[PDB]
Amino acid sequence: DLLASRSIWAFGPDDRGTNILRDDTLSTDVDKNVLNSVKEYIKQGFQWGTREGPLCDETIRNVNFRLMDVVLAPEQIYRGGGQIIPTARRVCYSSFLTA
Amino acid sequence: TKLYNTVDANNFYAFARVYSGQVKKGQKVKVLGENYSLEDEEDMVVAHIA
């Protein structure tokens, strides 16, 4: 479908990888600039998580991580890339395990 | 793209195709790694050409 096809963010790990970072944030999000600010370093977290698997220290294949909801109220001062990358890696691991 | 053994396994010969310019022995050249870019400028290494 259309929005899903337009929502492809990155491939993991690195180019030629067999994982898809997709995002379905329901639209209706005023914080588009905030989303595009946090995307550039959630990409790195997704690559890190899908390169080093949680099941074993190994790469992940044939899986799309479709983002559901992101909530963050305060200003851009509190949005540290290094503060949020481990969260992305951990949530990717947990989603993969639940699958 | 390749490194070749000397007759005794002590040093390697780099197999290169010169795409442009000219090269002379003793020249100072800068070696770029596999992921050298504007983000990662630390893969650079200065070396001579023996």
Partner: protein, 81 residues
Amino acid sequence: SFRELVEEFCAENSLLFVPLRRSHLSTGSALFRISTQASKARGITVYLRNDIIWKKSPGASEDTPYDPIGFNEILLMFNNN
């Protein structure tokens, strides 16, 4: 572990922890790059061994040894510029 320790320490100081997809030629450890902000001219290249962060002087050859660095040294060098 110490890896999560340095991760949350960098998180506290509003830094960016970027993994450089490289391995040290002599020790085989992964190399990481910590940038203070979008200004990329200043960035620290560091690898982790036996729970101590190892640093290299800028412009030094790979065969040169790695000198130690601390959290307070990192903050001192990142807060004055």
